Ligand binder design. Structure first.
Ligand SMILES: [Cu+2]
Ligand SMILES: [Cu+2]
Ligand SMILES: [Zn+2]
Ligand SMILES: [Zn+2]
Lengths: 153, 153
């Protein structure tokens, strides 16, 4: 399996380790791990275009979007490659992430290797919020923690 | 030109930003930037195999070595792909890095995207130290700071 990992860090208490596994290069990516230091509820969760951490999470740029589409949820045809939707933190502040996605890859043009995984302040509205922002970022708000996605063993 | 960047951090004071530019795939990669908080002198500088920051610099693994060769200097035919040799810190603790290398790439099999750049405590002996450690790490010692190499604009 190609395997990857992103270690999320930010200026606040949010931190975690997200694993990626893709046993077959033409199959889906499994995404799992823990994020702690979160407020309870839903948090936007995306792969952004750049693996650039020179100005914290800001320099990651927008959502990874090689096909130049509008923001959506991961179940939508109209989405960014990087749109993984939401993760859910429990009342103890821990999101135990478990996602499977067939649009991102660990190889090829849709590869997220060397790109930044970001967990956001608020819920991703999945492009249904009735404004321009909904259609670019899902209104998920500010970037709480991020990590460059790296090749793992 | 693909571009990449690594932001180096560790537990101590060592930190910097390293840029990569490769105008042509199969052309040389230019490597430049600045690392501060170093002791004056030579410091080993390598791309390691994994972009895995879960246990700090230790989980980056060994030098990036897809051709299974012995450790060397960047001018040697017998080297690891990740062997970028030494960088030099002036008396104010700053290494102004400026390197061109044609063995690493920002794409293909020798791509360092998603892999960890590491700067070391001691000088790399470029595989000429006559012990077993020399042919693996160059006796560069401990890992002061590291960063996952990410895609930049
Ligand atoms: Cu995002
Ligand atoms: Cu090294
Ligand atoms: Zn999006
Ligand atoms: Zn080496």
């Amino acid at each position: 399996a190609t395997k990857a990992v992103a270690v999320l860090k930010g200026d606040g208490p949010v931190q975690g380790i997200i694993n990626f596994e893709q046993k077959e290069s033409n199959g889906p990516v499994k995404v799992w791990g823990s994020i702690k230091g979160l407020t309870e509820g839903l948090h936007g969760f995306h792969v952004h275009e750049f693996g650039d951490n020179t100005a914290g999470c800001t320099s990651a740029g927008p959502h990874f979007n090689p096909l130049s589409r509008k923001h959506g949820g991961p179940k939508d045809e109209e989405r960014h490659v990087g749109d993984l939707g939401n993760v859910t933190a429990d009342k103890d502040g821990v999101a135990d992430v478990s996602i499977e996605d067939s649009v991102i890859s660990l190889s090829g043009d849709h590869s997220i290797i060397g790109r930044t995984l970001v967990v956001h302040e608020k819920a991703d509205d999945l492009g249904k919020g009735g404004n321009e922002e909904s259609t670019k970022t899902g209104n998920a708000g500010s970037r709480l923690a991020c990590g460059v996605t790296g090749i793992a063993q």
